[PDB]
Design a protein around this ligand. Sequence first.
Ligand SMILES: [Mg+2]
Length: 122
Amino acid sequence: MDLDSYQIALEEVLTWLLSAEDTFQEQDDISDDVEDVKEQFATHETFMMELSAHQSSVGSVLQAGNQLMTQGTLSDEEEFEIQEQMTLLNARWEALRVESMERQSRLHDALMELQKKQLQQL
Ligand SMILES: [Mg+2]
């Protein structure tokens, strides 16, 4: 019942996370040209908006797993399954969050740098 609904919500999250990881992995290196950097930067900001919008769902699933585990109604096998799912979900969410943020910093700095290199050639 609450096991079932946790499992449906975990599948929704993980389906979306696997693809967001793949998309992240497939974004190209930061381009040396300011018009290409604009588009990479613009693409990644939209991605960061996507991450943010999914953050409560990740936390919501992690909270549901935690409640199922503390409440005591589940088998030992199911608990080992849930604990491993929560541990890995949390590590994947966090890896993607850190790497995406680093990517955002680099694109921000690249775009500001390339723009200002245009400006000082007035
Ligand atoms: Mg943002």
